[PDB]
Amino acid sequence: SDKIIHLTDDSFDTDVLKADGAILVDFWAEWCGPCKMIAPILDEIADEYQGKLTVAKLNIDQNPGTAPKYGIRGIPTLLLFKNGEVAATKVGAASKGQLKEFLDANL
Ligand SMILES: [Cu+2]
Ligand SMILES: [Cu+2]
């Protein structure tokens, strides 16, 4: 968790929308087992990709306003923002290797 940005509905418009560079946003909730499984993978990705990527998390139960802005249907959903715009999307479970493939194709 040392490299994960904790987002809220109150901070999203600053920390994501006013940021240049790439930010991987994980939309999650505590009831979601696959979300909890990807959590340690995100710590590893945040470290390996530091300096070309920031990793952030938004809990959709605590912060219900953001996900509908992007039409999110279910979780996990990962949105890769580049300079305030969604540039890539991945839904559902992902292994480390699958997440690295997704990031490498988009960074
Ligand atoms: Cu950490
Ligand atoms: Cu490292």
End-to-end Cα spacing for the chain: 22
Domain that holds residue 54: 1-107
Backbone breaks in the chain (C–N > 2.5 Å) follow which residues? none
Ligand number, closest to the Cα atom of 2: 1
State the method: X-ray
CB 6 within 8 A of CB 13: no
Ligand 1 center from residue 53 Cα (angstroms): 15
Ligand 2 center from residue 47 Cα (angstroms): 5
The active-site residue, picked from 5, 19, 29, 32, is 32
CB 23 within 8 A of CB 58: no
- Amino acid identity, position 42: L
Compute the distance between CA of residue 34 and CA of residue 60 in angstroms, rounded to an integer. Answer: 15
Instruction: Supply φ then ψ for residue 57, to 5 degrees.
Output: -130, 140
Report the relative pairing of strands 54-59 and 22-28 from DSSP bridges.
Answer: parallel
CATH number of the domain that 64 lies in? 3.40.30.10
Ligand 2 center from residue 48 Cα (angstroms): 5
Q: Name the domain count of the chain.
A: 1
What does this entry list as its resolution, in Å? Answer: 1.2
The percent of the chain in helix, strand and coil, each rounded to the nearest 5, is: 35, 25, 40
